[PDB]
């Protein structure tokens, strides 16, 4: 059960990837969209993350590594990576595991850490953020 703000983030990120003709919507497109999702942004600010820098690192990586669909290709369109699908399913699983239903951008951010070979998880750890830092913020603020 994705809350309204997350849903908006997911749909706009998807629309932007389609306008750029990206073949794939990645976990990096996802983290980029979360930079302005209130829930996830608050958690990153609580971890003193340089959001301007993370944003640039994500945009550069997305641009250099995401294949672009050719004009000719009008039969297939942007699709999520397996990694992206797993993060969303994992965010729902984690929330339901605690008996709740409302999924926020912050829960999605927590789930990203489990995609160990994703550039997004790498950039988050590079900015000294751990899964537990985020869970602590969600549980206890500060």
């Amino acid at each position: 059960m994705l809350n309204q703000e997350l849903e908006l983030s997911l749909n706009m990120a998807f629309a932007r990837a389609r306008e750029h003709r990206h073949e794939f919507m990645t976990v990096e497109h996802l983290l980029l969209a979360l930079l302005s999702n209130p829930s996830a942004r608050e958690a990153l600010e609580a971890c003193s993350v340089d959001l301007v820098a993370l944003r640039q690192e994500l945009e550069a990586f997305i641009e250099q590594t995401t294949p672009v669909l050719p004009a000719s290709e009008e039969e297939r369109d942007t699709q999520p990576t397996l990694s992206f699908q797993r993060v969303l399913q994992r965010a729902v699983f984690h929330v339901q595991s605690s008996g709740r239903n409302e999924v926020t951008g912050a829960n999605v951010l927590v789930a990203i850490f489990s995609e160990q070979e994703s550039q997004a998880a790498y950039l988050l750890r590079k900015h000294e953020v751990s899964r537990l830092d985020v869970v602590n913020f969600i549980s206890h603020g500060t």
Binding site: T65, T66, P67, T81, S83, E117, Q119
Partner: protein
């Protein structure tokens, strides 16, 4: 202590059941090669037993591999696509 995830080679493996035409179909449809280059890669798979179709991030490589294998399955060919650290 932190290194970026690495890039991956996406490979097409040879088999005796899958038609050359389908291998070419796959190279054009999932890797955007034109007929000429797809044909060269199909011959390489035939002779070397396998060939690299592209190099991508681990995340993108995993997805392409799944897409190719589902397409082969759907068309009932045992065409096997795999990935390997670059």
């Amino acid at each position: 202590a932190l290194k970026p995830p690495s890039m991956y080679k996406v490979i097409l493996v040879n088999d005796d059941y899958t038609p050359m035409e389908f291998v070419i179909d796959v190279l054009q449809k999932f890797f955007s090669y034109d007929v000429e280059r797809a044909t060269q890669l199909m011959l390489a798979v035939h002779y070397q037993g396998k060939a690299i179709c592209g190099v991508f991030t681990a995340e993108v490589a995993e997805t392409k591999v799944a897409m190719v294998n589902k397409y082969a399955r759907e068309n009932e060919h045992p065409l096997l696509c795999t990935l390997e650290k670059a």
